[PDB]
Write a protein that binds this ligand. Sequence first.
Ligand code: FES
Length: 56
Amino acid sequence: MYVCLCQGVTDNQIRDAIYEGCCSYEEVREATGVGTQCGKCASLAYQVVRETLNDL
Ligand code: FES
């Protein structure tokens, strides 16, 4: 699903960044651009990051 429409980031793309070593929401933002242009997606993006990290 889409997480971030401003940057076109999907939940799979967030997981891809974590599977390449990102270990925090901030690093996922650095790798994907999620949440950089407005406030709408931050809550969802953080939840996807946390669920993904907890499953590793
Ligand atoms: S929807 Fe993600 S930065 Fe705007």
